[PDB]
Ligand binder design. Structure first.
Ligand SMILES: CSc1ccccc1CC(=O)N1CCC[C@](F)(C(N)=O)C1
Ligand SMILES: [Zn+2]
Length: 139
């Protein structure tokens, strides 16, 4: 679990979105596993606008933050689930690090601010859904 709160927006993994998220829907993209909903309070997370390939993520299954090197956003195939058939997930970055189902939603940050949220993993790998291209989150 976990979300990004920026301005009047809440960004979450689409497979974990609530009834409230869907009732207050701004935008969603199944291929990115992202959903954005509107909020009543002002969010203060800063979104990074960069091409960093290093950062720190929060890993709930370890109650710890870990430093990581991560790949550039790309199409990476993925397997099924209560959520989505076999498929390519776009705007996805991979890193060598611990993740288990339950870690989805943990924030990845670089010196510039929020980069994305944990989405996918397994085998000593962890994936992050990038949010740095969603320029509209700021305005
Ligand atoms: C951190 S998730 C993880 C980690 C280790 C092992 C397994 C998982 C689970 C996982 O990869 N998925 C199930 C939930 C939806 C999913 F995140 C997606 N974006 O399609 C795929
Ligand atoms: Zn950065």
């Amino acid at each position: 679990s976990g979300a990004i709160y920026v301005g009047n927006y809440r960004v979450v993994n689409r497979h974990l979105a609530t009834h409230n998220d869907w009732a207050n829907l701004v935008w969603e993209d199944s291929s990115r596993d992202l959903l954005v909903s509107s909020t009543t309070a002002q969010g203060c997370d800063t979104i990074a606008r960069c091409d960093c390939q290093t950062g720190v993520y929060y890993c709930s299954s370890r109650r710890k933050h870990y430093p990581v090197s991560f790949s550039k956003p790309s199409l990476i195939f993925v397997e099924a689930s209560e959520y989505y058939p076999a498929r390519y997930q776009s705007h996805l970055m991979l890193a060598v690090g611990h993740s288990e189902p339950g870690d989805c939603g943990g924030i990845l940050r670089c010196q510039h601010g929020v980069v994305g949220i944990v989405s996918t993993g397994g085998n000593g790998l962890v994936g992050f859904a990038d949010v740095r291209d969603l320029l509209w989150l700021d305005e």
